[PDB]
Symmetry: D2
Subunit: 223 residues, 4 copies
């Protein structure tokens, strides 16, 4: 349905520039859109090794990978196979700001999902936990998703926390807009999406590489 | 009954406040079910009524004792009883207005009653905005994140709240709370979620400004 | 002397406050020169001393009557006299803490004295931070932007402030003020700048917490 | 001094993507670095006509154009001819966020200053004053500039206001980092910089074009 099988293959292309550093990453993955799990492998093909932590990029590389229950309209899967676009701002507690823009499309032939990402940040402190690579993982989150009735789009709101190697937290505010390419027939009532996102660095002598795994579920307001 | 608490209980409220320069004083009584996370309270404005602003900005100002905890998570609030606890919270509204609230909570075991004393102050709400124009209906149901601060012995609350407007729209507000037991706790909870739902019905009339709040709160671990 | 004002004048202060849950009350007297924008005040903590926090967060809490205006800009504050004016201000500190301040100012023509009554509340300052650790020295000189809000008859103040730390560093705070004359003004100023410089010297000892503030303020148009 | 004459010629290259819209602008100008005035002409060479207001870009296209008094260290002119780089975040009252990154260099041969700008924004409201082109001019500002002692860099802080066609204001918060390419010998004490920046659109049937003029002076804390 909507050009999607239970198991799918996926591909990523990030162009970024963080604190003045330009880089370029590409990746491949195997996801399960209906179970809302995915797993992708990324490899830096310019600007390696990155002067900053891998974690700020995690959210840059898809709400299609989110288990919806029957009774909540699945905006993202609905928008397929044409797909959708989002833009997102990141505000970190220590004054840095990243913006990310993404264009997602499905190739029904390939049974593959294409991501094309623009990612830019500034004013990370040189001796801060990002630029000094002090971060372990984003902590599990509960994102609020809300319709915007007359624009035909969705709004993402979530206060994220990056876990630092000493045990502390590094707060970021994500505010996403999600916008399907087609005019959506049916629109969701607001709900929640919980996320659990992991990273293992798999770097080596030649390339910088790591793997992400996400699991995302939508839930209602319930109670 | 181990912490001055009981399945069914009773509550009382005193808020002194000033919003956009306007002073007020409100009190109320309520019946609560701490272990089921259900409370109900009736409030009356006794000085400075009718409020030139919406009642809704005050609702969250008036107790995380009223939260259903599952047994696998340390209930810091109930443990803090009967001495009880205090919190300070900031409200950052999308149209730039800011409120602060301080609250002291304590249990009278003799009365089986829980006492709240609330200081609430707010500045720079636009005259033409949905608060000073009383365009608001109700806070929308929420999911608050609660995190331990191990070495301070205190909890931090972070939630992005939304107030519904009669039009149909949303008016955002950022709540950042610190909750601090009066007595050094031995067990601290690992972080978790608490979901809230809070409704209001105005019950006013000619003589007095009055209204009722119903809150239902449950704590969860991460769902995954 | 047209607005209850004089070249040389005298002032008095009452602040009730609560920061990170700690209640206090402070008063003071001062001598001011409204037309030269120079004031000097001595403050004493009379309830809840010694403060568990830095004195500096209160300084800007304690009057834009004390501002040298050039003759080509409407001085809304002096015009508001002798009835006077009120303001509400929010302090957003970089380490997430938030304060709110409300102030009522009025002149006694009989005393040639200017009366300030200040409500000041602050929440969520980190225990280990430069405020609760009293690491602060002095606000750094500023340039505040003042803008008319024509149809509300009121002024908005916006300034990014910096508090110097003994290390050498800066600790930022965002001030957003509304200033509101008690009486509907006929002339409103076009927007302008006001530059401030505000110094403190603690004058405390065994018996009482005491200190002195000196402020000098001048208003400018855009320099270009 | 520092590879700069009293009158200079200047050139601009912006790549941007705003609310998902990609574009590309180039420009030329005549500036007076020591009198702190400049004037540049810009022309959109991709993505014209822009779906958003010209004004959000003004600050994207140089603190070399700033009259310093003798007694304040001129960081920017000092950093020349090698030049400098900056990154800046824009936070607008209605929740939109833009980031901009710039690389400035002087060509002593040409007596010309080169700008190369990356500019990206998200989450402008579709019916807001930006996307609906409701803006007239940035209102005159007073920017605070502060040394960062041990990093060898400067920090920019200024609350900006865009004037709307109805007469109101649209607040943005600029927070810039300025970073010379060379290790600076001497460092400034903090000061102010006042700016007055103007726009006149000079569009026509074929291209979108407009002119900016700035005047910037540094002043001390004085009083």
């Amino acid at each position: 349905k909507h050009g999607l099988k239970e198991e799918m293959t996926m591909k990523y292309h990030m162009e970024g520039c963080v604190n003045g550093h330009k880089f370029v990453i590409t990746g491949e993955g195997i996801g399960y859109p209906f179970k809302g799990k995915q797993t992708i492998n990324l490899c830096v093909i310019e600007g390696g090794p990155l002067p900053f932590s891998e974690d700020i990029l995690s959210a840059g590389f898809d709400r299609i990978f989110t288990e919806y229950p029957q009774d909540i309209v699945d905006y993202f899967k609905n928008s397929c196979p044409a797909g959708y676009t989002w833009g997102r701002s990141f505000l970190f507690e220590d004054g840095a700001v990243c913006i990310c823009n993404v264009d997602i499309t499905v190739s029904v032939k390939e049974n593959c999902i294409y991501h094309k990402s623009i990612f830019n940040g500034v004013n990370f402190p040189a001796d801060g936990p990002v630029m000094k690579k002090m971060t372990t993982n984003w902590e599990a989150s509960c994102e609020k998703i809300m319709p915007v009735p007359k624009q035909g789009i969705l709004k993402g709101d979530v206060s994220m926390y990056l876990l630092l190697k000493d045990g502390g937290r590094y707060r970021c505010q994500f505010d996403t807009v999600y916008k399907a390419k087609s005019v959506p027939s049916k629109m969701p009532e607001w709900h929640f999406i919980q996320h659990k996102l992991l990273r293992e660095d798999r770097s080596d002598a030649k390339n910088q590489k790591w793997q992400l795994t996400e699991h995302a579920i939508a839930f209602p307001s319930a109670l």
